[PDB]
Design a protein around this ligand. Structure first.
Ligand SMILES: NC(=O)c1ccc[n+]([C@@H]2O[C@H](COP(=O)([O-])OP(=O)(O)OC[C@H]3O[C@@H](n4cnc5c(N)ncnc54)[C@H](OP(=O)(O)O)[C@@H]3O)[C@@H](O)[C@H]2O)c1
Ligand SMILES: C[C@H]1COc2c1c(Oc1cccc(-c3nnn[nH]3)c1)cc1nc(N)nc(N)c21
Length: 244
């Protein structure tokens, strides 16, 4: 049987006339101010190797790559796979940003050692550029072999849409739901220009099953309660869906 593909995503419900949409982005970033708990969950989950001496890959569209501030990409301790139609041109720039990322990480390692910090094994940092999502799955598999840990599809809408259309193989969605806290007991909505490519089929479990908190906990390797948690002016919860 074939290894599962995990979509990880934070969404916000937007009621429309015809149906609730799930908003994920505005103007090339996220629709909401920084949610610390979502970012740390995202960081921990996508970094955490499924067995010792492996490194997880994140596969992402080029715009999502661009959405991270430049000094913070490629994202550390994971293999970053950037999907594009301009492999040639994006490669050169990714190479450039990787090498700067390398410089930062090296200085930090030297400093930590100099500080007497107990160094240990851990996943590596890489970035490679592929011409498609299938190509990226192949590429990362060929490059890393048995050092490859789990594979996440981390967005955005075009790559997610591609992930969901792959010819069957398990696909699971780890989703953080994000909602403004009510004011005078009405809940305002986030403006988004980018949406998760499906919505209703998840909320009404049509071809999808919402799984137990226990199941998600197993997927992501840390306790997930699936309870709402207050984070300033938003509340958030983590859930999972598997295709049926
Ligand atoms: N809330 C969340 O969890 C979350 C997660 C991720 C992203 N987002 C948000 O979503 C937005 C970006 O999403 P998006 O859909 O606009 O962009 P996207 O899917 O991240 O990237 C689209 C780009 O990826 C490349 N690409 C897409 N389809 C391809 C194909 N079939 N073959 C080859 N290359 C392909 C192309 O790059 P080239 O232009 O270089 O060809 C295309 O322009 C941002 O607002 C981001 O903040 C949110
Ligand atoms: C990265 C975007 C794209 O997908 C995601 C991003 C994101 O924002 C950032 C921004 C800047 C840095 C980071 C970051 N820190 N450590 N690792 N990543 C994340 C948050 C996400 N949350 C969920 N639940 N799922 C995703 N697919 C997410």
């Amino acid at each position: 049987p074939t290894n599962p593909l995990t979509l990880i995503v934070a969404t916000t419900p937007i009621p429309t006339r015809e149906k609730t949409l799930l908003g994920i982005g505005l103007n090339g970033t996220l629709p909401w101010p920084r949610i610390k708990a979502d970012m740390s969950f995202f960081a921990r989950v996508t970094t955490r190797p499924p067995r010792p001496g492996t490194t997880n890959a994140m596969i992402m569209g080029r715009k999502t790559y661009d959405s991270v501030p430049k000094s913070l990409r490629p994202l550390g301790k994971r293999i970053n796979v950037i999907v594009t139609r301009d492999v040639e041109g994006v490669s050169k720039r990714v190479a450039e940003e990787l090498k700067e990322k390398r410089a930062k990480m090296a200085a930090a390692a030297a400093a930590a050692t100099s500080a007497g910090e107990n160094k240990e094994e851990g996943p590596i940092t890489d970035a490679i550029v592929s011409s498609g999502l299938e190509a990226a799955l192949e590429d990362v598999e060929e490059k890393f072999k048995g050092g490859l840990g789990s594979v996440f599809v981390i967005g955005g809408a075009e790559i997610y849409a591609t992930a969901l259309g792959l010819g069957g193989r398990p696909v699971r969605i780890v989703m953080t739901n994000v909602e403004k806290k009510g004011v005078d007991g009405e809940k305002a909505v986030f403006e988004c220009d980018t949406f998760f490519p499906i919505d209703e089929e998840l909320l009404m479990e049509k071809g999808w099953r919402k799984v137990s908190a226990e199941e998600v906990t197993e997927w992501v390797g840390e306790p997930v309660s699936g309870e709402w948690k207050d984070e300033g002016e938003v509340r958030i919860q983590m859930v999972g869906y598997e295709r049926v």
